[PDB]
């Protein structure tokens, strides 16, 4: 997942994905992933925060219910 290489550099088709160079940060790699419900007494509904929208965590990591 985080380390996937050569899939998209070899052909525009196929389930394989990735470029010529391995880079988890440039690819889909969680990095400092934070749950949207961190710092909340209850879990937010799925899809509550649209992707790309500016979002501020309610609390630090580990405070999810």
């Amino acid at each position: 997942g985080p380390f996937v290489v050569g899939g998209e550099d070899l052909d525009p088709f196929g389930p394989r994905r990735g470029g010529m160079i391995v880079d988890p940060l440039r690819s889909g790699f969680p990095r400092a992933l934070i749950d949207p419900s961190s710092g909340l007494p209850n879990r937010l509904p799925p899809g509550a925060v649209p992707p790309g929208a500016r979002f501020d965590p309610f609390g630090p990591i580990g405070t999810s219910p």
């Binding site: 710092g39 007494p41 209850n42 580990g62 405070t63």
Partner: protein, 202 residues
């Protein structure tokens, strides 16, 4: 969360801890989980804070309108029935376990349990919340019929202290409410006022 209501001859005694958690973080350590629905009717809230708060507000609104219409003090059974109807109609959308305790001119002290799902049962005493599991044996072996108001207060305080000691989601201070014909008496147990049980060592 640990909530507890016990019935004595003149009325009821309600108790709750004060810890509200978001995961393992205590967001509010002085929470007030005893909610007055009417003059002589209180409710203990457990489960989702938003759901319980909204249901309590709606029941307060409906019961106030009903009491104004009838020009009569509301029954504890009526408040329990309103809570039960709301919690059963939305059992898939709500996460709310309620304990309704109060005093009636026609029925005296009454404790009603409305757990998740929306069933309603009258009990001599009720316990709810995540911390209530640890004190089932204690209340089973300790409760007796004919306890006075002071004995009921001591019993509730002891059970709440044990549950708070054992449960990680319970803690803070002990809030007690005694409801009878003269009125409602509230008190807070904190620090050394909370009953102490020595930890067994060696």
């Amino acid at each position: 969360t640990t909530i507890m209501a016990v019935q004595f001859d003149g009325g009821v005694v309600l108790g709750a801890d004060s810890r509200t958690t978001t995961g393992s973080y205590i967001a509010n350590r002085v929470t007030d989980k005893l909610t007055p629905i009417h003059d002589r009717i209180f409710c203990c809230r457990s489960g989702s804070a938003a759901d319980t708060q909204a249901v309590a507000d709606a029941v307060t609104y409906q019961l106030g309108f009903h009491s104004i219409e009838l020009n009569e003090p509301p029954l504890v059974h009526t408040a329990a029935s309103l809570f039960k109807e709301m919690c059963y109609r939305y059992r898939e959308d709500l996460m709310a376990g309620i304990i309704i305790a109060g005093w009636d001119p026609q029925e005296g002290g009454q404790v009603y349990s409305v757990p998740m799902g929306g069933m309603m049962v009258r009990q001599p005493f009720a316990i709810g919340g995540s911390g209530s599991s640890y004190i089932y044996g204690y209340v089973d072996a300790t409760y007796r019929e004919g306890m006075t108001k002071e004995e009921c207060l001591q019993f509730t305080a002891n059970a709440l202290a044990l549950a708070m000691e054992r449960d990680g989601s319970s803690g803070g201070v002990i809030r007690l409410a005694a409801i009878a014909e003269p009125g409602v008496e509230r008190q807070v147990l904190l620090g050394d006022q909370i009953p102490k049980f020595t930890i067994a060592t060696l």
